Amino acid sequence: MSKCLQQLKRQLQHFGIDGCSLADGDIDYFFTVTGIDRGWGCGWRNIQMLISWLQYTNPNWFKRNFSSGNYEINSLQSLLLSAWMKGIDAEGYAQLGDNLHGKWIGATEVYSLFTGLFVNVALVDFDFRSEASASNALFLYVKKHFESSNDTSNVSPCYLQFQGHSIIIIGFCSSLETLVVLDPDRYQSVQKKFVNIADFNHCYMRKKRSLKFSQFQLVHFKQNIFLNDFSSKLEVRSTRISDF
Ligand code: NA
């Protein structure tokens, strides 16, 4: 689904869901297919969505990195290996020699790949004893991330990781205190007409009670989106938010 922020804004207005702040620019939706890349493709599909956001917001960066406009998963395997070979992620050598096809990837690989593309990546680690506290801190940070009063084009989507699954956060809904998300493992519940608000919510909204995890990893791009060199970003350094 191409340019899915324009249509999603219309659906939010149609269902009367107020208080939504979404990422700037636009984004394409990428999804896994059951019996093909379902169960390991989610992280790769989420990287594809983040690439599409960069594509809409800086075409020059996109032309420079994807000369044929091709960022299929095979292109991403080259970029991930390239980042490891350039010294990004101190522990990246531990995955040299693996098959990159079929490989589950996480926030560290998301950081490594985009850092190798000279993208300025922020990584936030939510690590709590209390499950309620973890979602409280996460939801507040994400809510503040998407809040913007001035006309900007640098509010990026977020990659959210929990328990091996990952999704893209494209906004926050303050009337419901829910994440607005693009989940690559829920293609079956998108490719049809939404008539009831309940089906829309199950697809695009994540309440705190739907994310009963005590650990989250969050990746997004910074206000200064692009780097001149990643020599200072070789080590994966996250900011840790915790109650212990
Ligand atoms: Na803005």
Residue numbers in the entry: 1 to 244
Authors' own words:
Like mammals, the fission yeast Schizosaccharomyces pombe encodes a single ZUFSP family member, Mug105, which is much shorter than human ZUP1 and lacks all recognizable ubiquitin-binding domains. Interestingly, this fungal protein preferentially cleaves K48-linked ubiquitin chains. Since sequence analysis of Mug105 did not identify any ubiquitin-binding domains, we set out to investigate the basis of Mug105 specificity by solving the crystal structure of full-length Mug105 to a resolution of 2.0 Å. The asymmetric unit contained two Mug105 molecules. Mug105 assumes a globular α/β papain-fold structure. The active site residues (Cys-42, His-165, and Asp-183) assume a geometry similar to other papain-fold cysteine proteases. Overall, the Mug105 structure bears a striking resemblance to the ZUP1 catalytic core domain, with an RMSD of 1.7 Å over 215 residues. As predicted by sequence analysis, all ubiquitin-binding domains of ZUP1 are absent from Mug105, and no additional UBD candidates are apparent from the structure. The Mug105 structure does not contain ubiquitin, but the recognition site of the ubiquitin C-terminal R-x-R motif appears to be conserved between ZUP1 and Mug105. The corresponding Trp-104 of the ubiquitin-less Mug105 structure is mainly adopting a conformation blocking the substrate-binding cleft.
The ZUFSP family, with ZUP1 as its sole human member, has a modular architecture with a core catalytic domain highly active against the ubiquitin-derived peptide RLRGG, but not against ubiquitin itself. A hallmark of ZUFSP proteins is a papain-fold catalytic core domain with the catalytic Cys–His–Asp triad and two conserved acidic residues recognizing the two C-terminal arginine residues of ubiquitin within the RLRGG motif. Except for the minimalistic Mug105 from S. pombe, all ZUFSP family members contain a number of N-terminal ubiquitin-binding domains, which are dispensable for catalysis itself, but are required for chain cleavage. Biochemical and structural studies suggest that the acquisition of two family-specific proximal domains have changed the default K48 preference of the ZUFSP family to the K63 preference observed in ZUP1 and its insect homolog.
